[PDB]
């Protein structure tokens, strides 16, 4: 599952 961590969500 790449949704959470393939971008930095801040």
């Amino acid at each position, epitope marked *: *599952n790449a*949704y*959470n*961590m*393939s*971008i930095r969500r801040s």
Partner: antibody
Amino acid sequence: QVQLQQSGDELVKPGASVKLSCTVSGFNIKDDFIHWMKQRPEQGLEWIGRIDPANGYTKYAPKFQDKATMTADTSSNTAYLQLSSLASEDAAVYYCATYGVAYWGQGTLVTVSA
Amino acid sequence: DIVLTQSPASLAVSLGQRATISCKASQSVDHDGDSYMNWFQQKPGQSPKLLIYAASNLESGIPARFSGSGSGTDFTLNIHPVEEEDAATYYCQQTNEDPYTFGGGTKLEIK
């Protein structure tokens, strides 16, 4: 099951504008940012920016701030990229992506005539 | 901005052997114990395909022959073993800091 279907290739004239689309199926676009990328064979891959379709908020790379306008419509699950005042260096393949950056559209070729 | 430098720019590898591609970032791409480096594969006329996210996570649908390692500024993509279908250009991408940036690509050929 998620598909990002981008609009067809465009031949554009210098100084004109063009609006590209990215129609998403199998995914509620309110659920994530949509990202736009540019690719040229020499300058490679560049991130143009991302839009949050749930609120319309946009973030651009500084080099694209007065070239690109990202919009989206949750009503049609479609994101748009408007390119303004086209010039030779705008000829490129443009991609949209979402689900973080895991799922990409097939790309739209923009060619600029002489 | 973060500059990503890949090494080598191109390589030819014998079928069935291992290959490693390096991506070095000009500043750290770490945050809160994670490393926001992705690896993509691209073949001519196709969109980039995500292989690895957050340095070491294998994307669903990608063979376990691909693995990612590294943290901070230094990252590697390993292919073990290399197969014919791996002929492609590989890109690293950081998503730690805006604007996201990509490496210049590494073209892999089979011999």
